[PDB]
Design a protein around this ligand. Structure first.
Ligand code: NA
Ligand code: NA
Lengths: 251, 251
């Protein structure tokens, strides 16, 4: 499996002028090793990223709707993204599940529609504090993945990347260890193996989407079931390249 | 009050190439009378609209979030829009209230943040079938407007336009009359007069945001409390200019 690093800018930066400066920074970055890099940005910055970002990396949307077009004021759809040549979207990020109240049914429908229409997806999952403390993390994550599975069209697993978010470690006063990251990525791989088979489980990249910074990326990358990262705040900083380059520590 | 016509493209068209063709069509349109025209489009098409649309009209977003930036994956914020020179946003469209579950608290916070940050807003309201049938339309609409009022900063009413959507006539098997449109726009004007005073009530444009087409725009425009339209499907068609030009029938 090729190591995979997505930079999720989230709702940043504030201005297109800043977005352009970030792209200029990324374009000069020297990548070591072998790694697939995707950069996700706010919708209004996607055209300028697609035009200006180094072509060995790919641009990603941060969300899409379930339909091709129509009476859905405020929503952006897959065909609109594709019309710019953009190939990726994030789906099911914790922030959308929690703040924007996106449920699994909505997310499954997005995954199916996106894949049927030629997109590649970074599909996010992860358990909250209660389930972590109860020792029921695998059960919760399995239920999420089990909702996602039927959405994936036959022959589309090549176009799926899964990101694990330790939501129990986001704004809770608890922190995740490297071991925690490894354990949950392995949990996901095993769910895939049990439900859709070893061939799929062996090719699907499973990312760690908790806090990833230059000070912990190498140790995390070395974990055997961690295939890369969905990076938050560091994606806006010069440290992003350190994280991209942590691939050399992943065997 | 200057007649006001917003074209809400909603989640259309499917491609940036189609968006560009639409802009070319709009740019050649001959406007008669005196009218303020705003065109709202999907986020990913906003940059090309801002660059290419005739400069006597203004571009609008179809939604914005409540914060300047941050950990809100998928969301677009006011500063991002403004960085392109875009001055307008729609807020509280029925489709977002209903499909995306946006509540009045969320919408009030958007209105306040947007106005504080120099945006102009088209704020949408309107009652559903139950309330229409119960003869409780004014009560429902008043509650919505009463939630909006405290959000409007002092001195910002010049930058507010309100759109009435007869949601009771959208996908219900019932249709709205011209008289219905007039009555509800008057209802809103009277709520403003009672709550924030005649001066504000007299300057705020109140739009009809039900079905507006070339075959009914002139009669609707002539209604005394109807100050313009938030146009749906016709905004994607050559008929949009007929609607823009209905201003000559509004005294
Ligand atoms: Na690894
Ligand atoms: Na009128």
């Amino acid at each position: 499996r090729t190591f995979f690093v997505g930079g999720n800018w989230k709702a940043n930066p504030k201005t297109v002028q800043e977005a352009e400066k970030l792209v200029e920074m990324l374009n000069g970055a020297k990548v070591e090793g072998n790694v697939e890099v995707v950069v996700a940005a706010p919708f209004v910055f996607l055209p300028t990223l697609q035009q200006k970002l180094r072509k060995d990396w790919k641009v990603s949307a941060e969300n899409v709707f379930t339909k091709p077009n129509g009476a859905f004021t405020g929503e952006v759809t897959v065909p609109m993204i594709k019309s710019f040549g953009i190939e990726w979207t994030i789906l099911g990020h914790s922030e959308r599940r929690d703040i924007l109240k996106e449920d699994d049914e909505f997310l499954a429908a997005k995954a199916k529609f996106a894949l049927e229409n030629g997109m590649k997806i970074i599909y996010c999952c992860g358990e909250h504090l209660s389930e972590r403390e109860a020792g029921k993390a695998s059960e919760f994550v399995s239920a999420q993945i089990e909702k996602m599975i039927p959405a994936i069209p036959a022959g589309k697993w090549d176009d799926v990347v899964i990101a694990y978010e330790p939501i129990w470690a986001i704004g809770t006063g608890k922190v995740a260890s490297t071991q925690d990251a490894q354990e949950m990525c392995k949990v996901i791989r095993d769910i895939l193996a049990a439900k859709v088979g070893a061939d799929i489980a062996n090719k699907v990249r499973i990312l760690y989407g908790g806090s990833v910074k230059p000070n912990n990326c190498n140790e995390l990358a070395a974990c055997p079931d961690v295939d890369g990262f969905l990076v938050g705040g560091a994606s806006l900083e010069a440290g992003f390249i350190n994280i991209v380059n942590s691939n050399v520590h992943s065997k």
